[PDB]
Design an enzyme around this catalytic site. Sequence first.
Site, PDB file in Angstrom:
ATOM      1  N   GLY A  16       0.798  -1.208   0.000  1.00  0.00           N
ATOM      2  CA  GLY A  16       0.000   0.000   0.000  1.00  0.00           C
ATOM      3  C   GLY A  16       0.833   1.261   0.000  1.00  0.00           C
TER       4      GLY A  16
ATOM      5  N   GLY B 292       1.376   5.185   1.955  1.00  0.00           N
ATOM      6  CA  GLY B 292       1.095   6.133   3.014  1.00  0.00           C
ATOM      7  C   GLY B 292       1.087   7.542   2.450  1.00  0.00           C
TER       8      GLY B 292
ATOM      9  CG  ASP C 259      -6.139   8.710  10.664  1.00  0.00           C
ATOM     10  OD1 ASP C 259      -7.249   8.990  10.166  1.00  0.00           O
ATOM     11  OD2 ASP C 259      -5.155   8.362   9.971  1.00  0.00           O
TER      12      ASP C 259
ATOM     13  CG  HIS D  26      -6.587   1.810   5.350  1.00  0.00           C
ATOM     14  ND1 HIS D  26      -6.467   1.103   4.172  1.00  0.00           N
ATOM     15  CD2 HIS D  26      -5.343   2.261   5.645  1.00  0.00           C
ATOM     16  CE1 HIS D  26      -5.211   1.143   3.761  1.00  0.00           C
ATOM     17  NE2 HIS D  26      -4.507   1.838   4.638  1.00  0.00           N
TER      18      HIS D  26
ATOM     19  CG  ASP E  62      -2.033   5.324   9.802  1.00  0.00           C
ATOM     20  OD1 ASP E  62      -1.026   6.060   9.725  1.00  0.00           O
ATOM     21  OD2 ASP E  62      -2.857   5.198   8.867  1.00  0.00           O
TER      22      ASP E  62
HETATM   23  C1  LIG Z   1      -2.020   0.245   7.964  1.00  0.00           C
HETATM   24  C2  LIG Z   1      -0.637   0.639   8.432  1.00  0.00           C
HETATM   25  C3  LIG Z   1      -0.536   1.819   9.163  1.00  0.00           C
HETATM   26  C4  LIG Z   1       0.666   2.261   9.633  1.00  0.00           C
HETATM   27  C5  LIG Z   1       1.831   1.520   9.385  1.00  0.00           C
HETATM   28  C6  LIG Z   1       3.077   1.955   9.875  1.00  0.00           C
HETATM   29  N1  LIG Z   1       3.176   3.147  10.618  1.00  0.00           N
HETATM   30  S1  LIG Z   1       2.775   3.187  12.230  1.00  0.00           S
HETATM   31  O1  LIG Z   1       2.393   4.514  12.580  1.00  0.00           O
HETATM   32  O2  LIG Z   1       1.915   2.086  12.476  1.00  0.00           O
HETATM   33  C7  LIG Z   1       4.267   2.807  13.099  1.00  0.00           C
HETATM   34  C8  LIG Z   1       4.355   1.599  13.756  1.00  0.00           C
HETATM   35  C9  LIG Z   1       5.506   1.256  14.434  1.00  0.00           C
HETATM   36  C10 LIG Z   1       6.576   2.127  14.479  1.00  0.00           C
HETATM   37  C11 LIG Z   1       6.496   3.337  13.824  1.00  0.00           C
HETATM   38  C12 LIG Z   1       5.347   3.676  13.130  1.00  0.00           C
HETATM   39 CL1  LIG Z   1       5.298   5.197  12.307  1.00  0.00          CL
HETATM   40  C13 LIG Z   1       4.196   1.185   9.609  1.00  0.00           C
HETATM   41  C14 LIG Z   1       4.098   0.007   8.867  1.00  0.00           C
HETATM   42  C15 LIG Z   1       2.904  -0.434   8.382  1.00  0.00           C
HETATM   43  C16 LIG Z   1       1.744   0.318   8.635  1.00  0.00           C
HETATM   44  C17 LIG Z   1       0.487  -0.109   8.153  1.00  0.00           C
HETATM   45  O3  LIG Z   1       0.452  -1.276   7.453  1.00  0.00           O
HETATM   46  C18 LIG Z   1       0.021  -1.336   6.168  1.00  0.00           C
HETATM   47  N2  LIG Z   1      -0.163  -0.201   5.500  1.00  0.00           N
HETATM   48  C19 LIG Z   1      -0.596  -0.172   4.258  1.00  0.00           C
HETATM   49  C20 LIG Z   1      -0.874  -1.353   3.596  1.00  0.00           C
HETATM   50  C21 LIG Z   1      -0.703  -2.571   4.241  1.00  0.00           C
HETATM   51  C22 LIG Z   1      -0.255  -2.579   5.563  1.00  0.00           C
HETATM   52  C23 LIG Z   1      -0.064  -3.901   6.217  1.00  0.00           C
HETATM   53  C24 LIG Z   1       0.605  -4.084   7.432  1.00  0.00           C
HETATM   54  C25 LIG Z   1       0.741  -5.362   7.936  1.00  0.00           C
HETATM   55  N3  LIG Z   1       0.246  -6.381   7.253  1.00  0.00           N
HETATM   56  C26 LIG Z   1      -0.372  -6.183   6.111  1.00  0.00           C
HETATM   57  N4  LIG Z   1      -0.871  -7.272   5.440  1.00  0.00           N
HETATM   58  C27 LIG Z   1      -1.600  -7.150   4.186  1.00  0.00           C
HETATM   59  C28 LIG Z   1      -1.492  -8.506   3.468  1.00  0.00           C
HETATM   60  C29 LIG Z   1      -2.320  -8.485   2.180  1.00  0.00           C
HETATM   61  C30 LIG Z   1      -3.776  -8.142   2.525  1.00  0.00           C
HETATM   62  N5  LIG Z   1      -3.798  -6.815   3.161  1.00  0.00           N
HETATM   63  C31 LIG Z   1      -3.071  -6.830   4.443  1.00  0.00           C
HETATM   64  N6  LIG Z   1      -0.527  -4.978   5.599  1.00  0.00           N
END
Ligand SMILES: Cc1ccc2c(NS(=O)(=O)c3ccccc3Cl)cccc2c1Oc1ncccc1-c1ccnc(N[C@H]2CCCNC2)n1
Lengths: 400, 398
Positions: free
Chosen positions: A19, A21, A129, A133, A152
């Site tokens: 995906g 961000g 937020d 999603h 997120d």
């Molecule tokens: C939503 C989100 C938000 C914040 C994220 C984020 N930022 S945070 O704010 O959560 C964060 C967390 C820890 C440390 C720092 C930060 Cl900033 C980091 C990494 C991922 C993040 C994240 O993850 C994703 N974001 C976009 C698309 C996909 C995923 C994702 C994550 C894990 N598994 C899957 N599986 C797929 C497999 C196929 C079917 N669909 C699911 N997808």
Amino acid sequence: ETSVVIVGKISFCPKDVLGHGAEGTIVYRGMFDNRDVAVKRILPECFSFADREVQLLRESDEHPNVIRYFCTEKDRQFQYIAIELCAATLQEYVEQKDFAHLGLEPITLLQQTTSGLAHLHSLNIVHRDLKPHNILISMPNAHGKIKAMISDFGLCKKLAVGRHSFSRRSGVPGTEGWIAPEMLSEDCKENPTYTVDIFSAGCVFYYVISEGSHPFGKSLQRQANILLGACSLDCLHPEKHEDVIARELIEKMIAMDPQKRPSAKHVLKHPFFWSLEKQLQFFQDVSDRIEKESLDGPIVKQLERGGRAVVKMDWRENITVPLQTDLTYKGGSVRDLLRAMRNKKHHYRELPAEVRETLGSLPDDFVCYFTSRFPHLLAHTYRAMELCSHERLFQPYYFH
Amino acid sequence: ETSVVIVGKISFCPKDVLGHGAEGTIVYRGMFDNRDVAVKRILPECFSFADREVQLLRESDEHPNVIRYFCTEKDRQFQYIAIELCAATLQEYVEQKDFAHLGLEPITLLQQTTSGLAHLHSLNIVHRDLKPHNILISMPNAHGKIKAMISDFGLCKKLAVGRHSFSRRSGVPGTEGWIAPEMLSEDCKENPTYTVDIFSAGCVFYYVISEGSHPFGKSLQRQANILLGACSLDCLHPEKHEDVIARELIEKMIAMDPQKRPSAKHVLKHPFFWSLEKQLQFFQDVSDRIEKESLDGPIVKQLERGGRAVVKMDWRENITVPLQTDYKGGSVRDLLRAMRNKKHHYRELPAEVRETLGSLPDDFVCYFTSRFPHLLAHTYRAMELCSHERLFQPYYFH
Ligand SMILES: Cc1ccc2c(NS(=O)(=O)c3ccccc3Cl)cccc2c1Oc1ncccc1-c1ccnc(N[C@H]2CCCNC2)n1
Ligand SMILES: Cc1ccc2c(NS(=O)(=O)c3ccccc3Cl)cccc2c1Oc1ncccc1-c1ccnc(N[C@H]2CCCNC2)n1
């Protein structure tokens, strides 16, 4: 598009985009420590911001329903954050999964989401937020169990010690269609606080149990409807026990007035999340509490207020003929409806065979006998006996 | 000595030794990802073994009460495993901490230890080396709450699918003094299984609540006493409700015959872990179950067996006189009927009677359990006859 990027302990193929961000942020499927991970790649413009987020997670107590990072890495051009690879977002779960045989699983994911939220709020963090999603659903463990995890944190605010709200600014208030009204309304005379998260979660609750609907309409009209206060929950039917209770909770969670929204810990105490056993235990505790209670006293008065609609004019006429035969109660009284349930629960083993059969097993079938016939019984009684919130014996049922 | 070792993301000063493992293994205090960590350093001859340990934990579901590694690194000479820096081992906890104001915390550490063990067993892992030294106590979180974590998987055995026991060999049975008898006994005709861990854990329970004692004696006599079956639990007093309950559980856990020891999941259902409120609800449900039961019936006969000692010959003569104001005094059943009745009609019975009993539910149940210290334990064991009935699900593990 066939290369593998290797940065420290994180590797991925850039073709495997999961995906996108904000600000050129991309999430890939990759690998870490011989595990599957999701990897967020961060552009130089967002390095300091990503660091602050990581640090907030680094400092904060962990919780099973709050996402936890596995690894961070940094090369010359990007920073990287790996988290556990999940099965689905809550959005995908709701869109794709047949709920027919999942039982209470979707409800447990909301309960797990509320726990993660309660955890954040207890750390003086407001998320701002929450949406389907970015609620992530884990892979099954060894016994087939899954869990919800909040992620997120790009809009979150850690409030200073002794601070309980934050004031509105010109900028980013959240995601369109999930933003609580006090973020955008015109005559708002109170700062936003933790309850903006409860409004969003309320919307999430309805989204899950309606399998795709939103209290404030289709996405193009949602945020406008939120400012107008125009909400509808018509996927919840007024004569289905489970729907009456879900509606009861969700209407409070999405209340226009933030001060009328329950806190996350309040939400977790709600009948929505009660087992059938606990529902029956509540009925019995209520019935025990209100016997010897005067008939014109405030408690039974509260209980009998509008109770005719609750017992359907005469509850003596709305039960099976075996129980009818084996029963001198007052059929227009909810107190006596409750009295009869406790009495038959108490003497259940002494009941004739045909009667135990028509009632069903204790506790599950027994309590369903009545809740399915009197769909407003629990919700009505739950609200009426909130007069006894403070009393110690009602501690399991309300949040103090 | 004053230098800092840096290996990938792990760093530590070799002066900061926290302890020594087996085969040249050393544990240091150090740092990882700006956190305090404990770092175990492993010699080449143990590389493969350590790799298998890490793999077992990488594949297995995590659990709040089973230790999790944060990081593994490797240079030319050593391999390294970082875990979270803890406040103490359970040994240090028991030895150093004043229990007087800790309330239920030490019991809570036992409960979390049992949950870790149940989790290990449900993954078909036998630990085989549970002892106070490798049960770690976390730092307090933001709300001052701590937890116990099982560590040290060097002797553990993951049993193959559809296998429930392991056979004896000439080698390492565990840590002397914590080794279940069936690992070392002469005429043992059954393979060791999960319950070797329940035996160790039973010794741990007594070690915590006795604040340093062991059921099989002082360190030098322990293992020999285990072989003899010579155990003593006399830090637990026969006329104290809490002590009676703990004794009931611990005696079963350290039983010479493994087949008499409760599984970790049974353990978790025991009254030892019950809140005062749940103890009362148990007394009420029991009362309701037996109210119409036949006197010659197998259920109340079970309850009245040895009943006289429980109710102190005549329970009417062992309560306070404002309660004596408003049964069969040699009957356990009537004692329980009286309790249920007084709880049920608590609002409408006079003020001075409500005063001696105390508030519901905590003070009320304590009125009876403090005056009849064998009542709960006796009733729990007798009503095991109804342990498979849905209604008694909260109280027994089915
Ligand atoms: C939503 C989100 C938000 C914040 C994220 C984020 N930022 S945070 O704010 O959560 C964060 C967390 C820890 C440390 C720092 C930060 Cl900033 C980091 C990494 C991922 C993040 C994240 O993850 C994703 N974001 C976009 C698309 C996909 C995923 C994702 C994550 C894990 N598994 C899957 N599986 C797929 C497999 C196929 C079917 N669909 C699911 N997808
Ligand atoms: C017991 C044990 C067993 C196995 C360990 C172990 N191996 S393992 O089998 O648990 C394992 C776990 C995960 C992955 C692989 C492996 Cl082999 C690795 C690392 C440490 C392990 C470990 O840890 C220690 N071992 C010896 C001495 C000290 C500690 C220790 C650990 C954390 N905090 C503190 N705090 C001090 C602070 C001052 C007061 N006293 C407490 N001490």
